[PDB]
UniProtKB/Swiss-Prot annotation, chain A:
The keyword Membrane does not apply. The lineage of its organism: Bacteria, Pseudomonadati, Pseudomonadota, Gammaproteobacteria, Enterobacterales. Part of the 30S ribosomal subunit. Contacts proteins S9 and S11. Cross-links to IF3 and the P and E site tRNAs. One of its GO terms (cellular component) is cytosol. The strain K12 sequence is shown. This is Small ribosomal subunit protein uS7. GO terms for biological process: cytoplasmic translation; negative regulation of translation; ribosomal small subunit assembly; translation. One of the primary rRNA binding proteins, it binds directly to 16S rRNA where it nucleates assembly of the head domain of the 30S subunit. Is located at the subunit interface close to the decoding center, where it has been shown to contact mRNA. Has been shown to contact tRNA in both the P and E sites; it probably blocks exit of the E site tRNA.
UniProtKB/Swiss-Prot annotation, chain C:
Coiled coil: none annotated. SUPFAM superfamilies: Ribosomal protein S10. InterPro entries: Ribosomal_uS10, Ribosomal_uS10_CS, Ribosomal_uS10_dom, Ribosomal_uS10_dom_sf. Pfam families: Ribosomal_S10. Keywords: Ribonucleoprotein, Ribosomal protein, Ribosome biogenesis, RNA-binding, Transcription, Transcription antitermination, Transcription regulation. GO terms for cellular component: cytoplasm; cytosol; cytosolic small ribosomal subunit; small ribosomal subunit; transcription elongation factor complex. One of its GO terms (molecular function) is structural constituent of ribosome. Part of the 30S ribosomal subunit. Can also form a heterodimer with the transcription antitermination protein NusB. Binding of S10 to NusB is mutually exclusive with its incorporation into the ribosome. The rRNA transcription and antitermination complex (rrnTAC) consists of RNAP, NusA, NusB, NusE (this protein), NusG, SubB, ribosomal protein S4, DNA and precursor rRNA; S4 is more flexible than other subunits. GO terms for biological process: cytoplasmic translation; regulation of DNA-templated transcription elongation; ribosome biogenesis; transcription antitermination. Belongs to the universal ribosomal protein uS10 family. This is Small ribosomal subunit protein uS10.
UniProtKB/Swiss-Prot annotation, chain E:
Keywords: Ribonucleoprotein, Ribosomal protein, RNA-binding, rRNA-binding, tRNA-binding. HAMAP family: Ribosomal_uS19. One of its GO terms (molecular function) is tRNA binding. GO terms for cellular component: cytoplasm; cytosol; cytosolic small ribosomal subunit. Belongs to the universal ribosomal protein uS19 family. Pfam families: Ribosomal_S19 (PF00203). This is Small ribosomal subunit protein uS19. PANTHER family: RIBOSOMAL PROTEIN S19P FAMILY MEMBER (PTHR11880), SMALL RIBOSOMAL SUBUNIT PROTEIN US19M (PTHR11880:SF8). In the E.coli 70S ribosome in the initiation state it has been modeled to contact the 23S rRNA of the 50S subunit forming part of bridge B1a; this bridge is broken in the model with bound EF-G. The 23S rRNA contact site in bridge B1a is modeled to differ in different ribosomal states, contacting alternately S13 or S19. In the 3.5 angstroms resolved ribosome structures the contacts between L5, S13 and S19 bridge B1b are different, confirming the dynamic nature of this interaction. Bridge B1a is not visible in the crystallized ribosomes due to 23S rRNA disorder. Part of the 30S ribosomal subunit. Binds S13 and L5 and cross-links to the A site tRNA. InterPro entries: Ribosomal_uS19, Ribosomal_uS19_bac-type, Ribosomal_uS19_CS, Ribosomal_uS19_SF. The lineage of its organism: Bacteria, Pseudomonadati, Pseudomonadota, Gammaproteobacteria, Enterobacterales. The gene is rpsS.
From Swiss-Prot, chain F:
PROSITE patterns: RIBOSOMAL_S13_1 (PS00646), RIBOSOMAL_S13_2 (PS50159). Located at the top of the head of the 30S subunit, it contacts several helices of the 16S rRNA. In the E.coli 70S ribosome in the initiation state was modeled to contact the 23S rRNA (bridge B1a) and protein L5 of the 50S subunit (bridge B1b), connecting the 2 subunits; bridge B1a is broken in the model with bound EF-G, while the protein-protein contacts between S13 and L5 in B1b change. The 23S rRNA contact site in bridge B1a is modeled to differ in different ribosomal states, contacting alternately S13 or S19. In the two 3.5 angstroms resolved ribosome structures the contacts between L5, S13 and S19 bridge B1b are different, confirming the dynamic nature of this interaction. It holds the Pfam family Ribosomal_S13. This is Small ribosomal subunit protein uS13. InterPro entries: Rbsml_uS13_C (IPR027437), Ribosomal_uS13 (IPR001892), Ribosomal_uS13-like_H2TH (IPR010979), Ribosomal_uS13_bac-type (IPR019980), Ribosomal_uS13_CS (IPR018269). It comes from Escherichia coli (strain K12). GO terms for cellular component: cytoplasm; cytosol; cytosolic small ribosomal subunit; small ribosomal subunit.
RNA sequence: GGCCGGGAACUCAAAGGAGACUGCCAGUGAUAAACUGGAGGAAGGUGGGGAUGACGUCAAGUCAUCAUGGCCCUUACGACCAGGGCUACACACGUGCUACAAUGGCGCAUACAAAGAGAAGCGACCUCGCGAGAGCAAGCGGACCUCAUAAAGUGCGUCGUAGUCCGGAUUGGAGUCUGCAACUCGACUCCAUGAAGUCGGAAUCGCUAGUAAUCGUGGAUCAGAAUGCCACGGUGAAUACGU
């Protein structure tokens, strides 16, 4: 806005574990006001993912995210009649938001049988450094690097 | 002796009586697990007793009516907080700083003429 | 036996005046009365268009309210019934008496 | 409205009041089960000789002050325009502008 | 329409049909009654039905029974 | 498996599979299977010759396939020949149950013609 | 089983009252007006939502709600009556409803609302019909009777990516009800048939918190005929670095 200051909304932690990050993830996954379905899908995915790697769900989730967090990005500027890409730094909250959004978008486009299965597959592949999420990170970083002259 | 509290949320009202000893909760003549099938609702109802270390020292008799699931859970939490304050009168600081002593005054907005909902307008075309 | 009175009005000051009058007369003639109990109010709504031609927004919303009261007399006597039936009240209060 | 339309309305109401009971009897005959099965045919043939305007469903509500056939309210006997005029002048007991 | 009522017909039409059948030969019969079901005792006759401007002559056959009279005199002109 | 002159799937349940006949819906499928005495979630692959003969006998009681098609064609032809309102609509290709024709009507008119 | 005797404590109903004022604390500022923080409190700085529309602009809309200056017709541009039309159909545009599916379809069985209407009216229990409905009949001018069973949800099975157990246009046969009367031209039920469509070019709209999105419920006009209009609650987000 122009002359406004906006505070931060409180978010309740998850019931099974106690993390607000997982609550934000469930929120980003939900559609049409159906929170119970999203909670089911997330919990099933984390359960099926813990076995594959022999570590706690929180640790697996953190490992998956650390390979998709971005650092720099490009904005568009046009004051002289031409569009330039300008590289800017990202802050931690936006890092987390973008990581989760990309993960979910990549999962939705897969071709397995159930949403839980697709999510588990995507999380495992991300931990192994493969998939569309990591591809998106790399593309954004390439675009940021190609325009260092405009900083 | 009994300690009493009234609680409210969206469209729900809850009457909470608390007595001392051997923690057990009855709600509308059923158990907590029978009544609520949602982990979030259970956690909400259980919060204040977890916050103040008295989980296994008080029996709770509750009645509630109006609304849905989340509204009723919130009403119950509010009522428990009021009853505990009546019982002790020194946990007020902790309960307030946690955030259970405030009433949540969020209601449903009305429909208005010329709109499809409270804030949604029809589609607009220039030509 | 027992007597029941129901009163209706569009104006609550008028209804309270009438109720106080009835209670006073009843009590003064040596008969117990159970204080007036308020009952739910009725709200009726209307919506109209305010232009003689096309314009479809631009409406007006109106309301009418009806107030209701109920009074109980537990042990009527002949003099009490006579006193009640020989009373007159305002012209905007509707009174119904049941035995 | 025109002067002839209200005349039509008055005529309709009069006839519909005149012929009420006969129609009720004939319709009871036709509706009731275990009838002669020939009285039914005769009654059906007879119910169509009574004048058409005698059926209550040929009537149309109109405002009592002007005659408008659209925008009618039943509690007041008038159309929206005249309802608003009376309401602002103060001639409808209990009515006032509402908000909530 | 309901089966517990029987088919509908106009009294004047029914009387005209009775008279024509008993008296034998009949030139076409003029009618404005398009809401009358066709009865079996009508076959062999000519009914001229209104359609808005003129009267269309219909010569009754045995496959028409159960139909209304109006279905054989359309009301609109299209080309 | 052949039933009424056609082959019905073999990996489906009986209630779904039987509906491949032109004249058998879900209700008639349930009725036939109840009359024959077979379950409803049994695959057509695990039946026997006796069961299949029973099902053929059950299906024989209805009108199906060519006879049904002949009936429909004769019905429509009767009207088209008589020349009533419905018949004219049938033989011009415009809707018959009194719908709108200022717009829409595209299942009876086909795709647009500029 | 609030059933019964009871109680006036609690939910709740509807009349009188109290409360929020930059009133108190620290800092900045012209020894100002104000601004950024904190205490208590249900609520804090316009607490949230309504009604309330300045002098004027567009010879803007309405002589078909009503009233009125001037013009025009009076065996007719005024009366009455049955049939038809306003529902047409090579085509072009605006506003909506249902979908193109596994965050799903189908079968069983089990929680939790709010606000309304009713005498030429709302119609319980019982019996008959696969069903829309039919017969006989209590109660209610109503915090009492009736309309009236909320749905999404939760638990257990089946379907396994197919133009399908996704979608439900069109058409054939047989019926129910209102009404003198359902051809043109009504709503609803049963059996059958099972079209287009696999997320939509250039353009382009709504929304800042109990909001968007999604699920059900009621009323006015009304013999009968809402996917429109006006109202009610349940579940419940994402983002605002800046000009």
């Amino acid at each position: 806005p122009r002359r406004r200051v906006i505070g931060q909304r409180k978010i309740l932690p998850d019931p099974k574990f106690g993390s607000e990050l997982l609550a934000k993830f469930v929120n980003i996954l939900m559609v049409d006001g159906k929170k119970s379905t999203a909670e089911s899908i997330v919990y099933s995915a984390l359960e099926t993912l813990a076995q594959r790697s022999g570590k706690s769900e929180l640790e697996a989730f953190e490992v998956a995210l650390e390979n998709v967090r971005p650092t720099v990005e490009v904005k568009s500027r046009r004051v002289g009649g031409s569009t330039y890409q300008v590289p800017v730094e990202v802050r931690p909250v936006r890092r987390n938001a973008l990581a989760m959004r990309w993960i979910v978008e990549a999962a939705r486009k897969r071709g397995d049988k159930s949403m839980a299965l697709r999510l588990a597959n995507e999380l495992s592949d991300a931990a192994e450094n493969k998939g569309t999420a990591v591809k998106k990170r790399e593309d954004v970083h390439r675009m940021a690097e190609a325009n260092k002259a405009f900083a | 002796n009994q300690y009493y509290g009234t609680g409210r949320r969206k469209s729900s009202a809850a009457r909470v009586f608390i007595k001392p000893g051997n923690g057990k909760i009855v709600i509308n003549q059923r158990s907590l697990e029978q009544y609520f099938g949602r982990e979030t609702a259970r956690m909400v109802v259980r919060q204040p007793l977890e916050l103040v270390d008295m989980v296994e020292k008080l029996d709770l008799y509750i009645t509630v009516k109006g609304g849905g699931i989340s509204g009723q859970a919130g009403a119950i939490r509010h009522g428990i907080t009021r009853a505990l304050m009546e019982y002790d009168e020194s946990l007020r600081s902790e309960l307030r700083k946690a955030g259970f002593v405030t009433r949540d005054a969020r209601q449903v907005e009305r429909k208005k003429v010329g709109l499809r909902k409270a804030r949604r307008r029809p589609q607009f075309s220039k030509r | 036996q027992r007597i029941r009175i129901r009163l209706k009005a569009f104006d609550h000051r008028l209804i309270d005046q009438a109720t106080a009058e009835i209670v006073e007369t009843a009590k003064r003639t040596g008969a117990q009365v159970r204080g007036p109990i308020p009952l739910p109010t009725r709200k009726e709504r209307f919506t109209v268009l305010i232009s003689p031609h096309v314009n479809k927004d631009a409406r007006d919303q109106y309301e009418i309210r009806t107030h209701l009261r109920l009074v109980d007399i537990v042990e009527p006597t002949e003099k009490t019934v006579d006193a009640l039936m020989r009373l007159d009240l305002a012209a905007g209060v509707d009174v119904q008496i049941s035995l | 409205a025109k002067q002839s339309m209200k005349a039509r309305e008055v005529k309709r109401v009069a006839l519909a009041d005149k012929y009420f009971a006969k129609r009720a009897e004939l319709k009871a005959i036709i509706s009731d089960v275990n009838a002669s099965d020939e009285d039914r045919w005769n009654a059906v043939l007879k119910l169509q000789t009574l004048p058409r305007d005698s059926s209550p469903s040929r009537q149309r509500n109109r405002c009592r002050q002007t005659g408008r056939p659209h925008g009618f309210l039943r509690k007041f006997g008038l159309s929206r325009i005249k309802v608003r005029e009376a309401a602002m002048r103060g001639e409808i007991p209990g009515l006032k502008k509402a908000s909530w | 329409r309901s089966l517990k009522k029987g088919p509908f017909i106009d009294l004047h039409l029914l009387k005209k049909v009775e008279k024509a059948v008993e008296s034998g030969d009949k030139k076409p019969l003029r009618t404005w009654s398009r809401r009358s079901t066709i009865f079996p005792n009508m076959i062999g006759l000519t009914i001229a039905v209104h359609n808005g401007r003129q009267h269309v002559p219909v010569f009754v056959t045995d496959e028409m029974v159960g139909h209304k009279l109006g279905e054989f005199a359309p009301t609109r002109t299209y080309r | 498996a052949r039933i009424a002159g056609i082959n019905i799937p073999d990996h489906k349940h009986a209630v779904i599979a039987l509906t491949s006949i032109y004249g058998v819906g879900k209700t008639r499928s349930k009725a036939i299977l109840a009359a024959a005495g077979i379950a409803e979630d049994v695959k057509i692959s695990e039946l026997s010759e006796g069961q299949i003969d029973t099902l053929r006998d059950e299906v024989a009681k209805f009108v199906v396939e060519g006879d049904l098609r002949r009936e429909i064609s004769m019905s429509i032809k009767r009207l088209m020949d008589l020349g009533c309102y419905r018949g004219l609509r049938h033989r011009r290709g415009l809707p018959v149950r009194g719908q709108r024709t200022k717009t829409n009507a595209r299942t009876r008119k086909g795709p647009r013609k500029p």
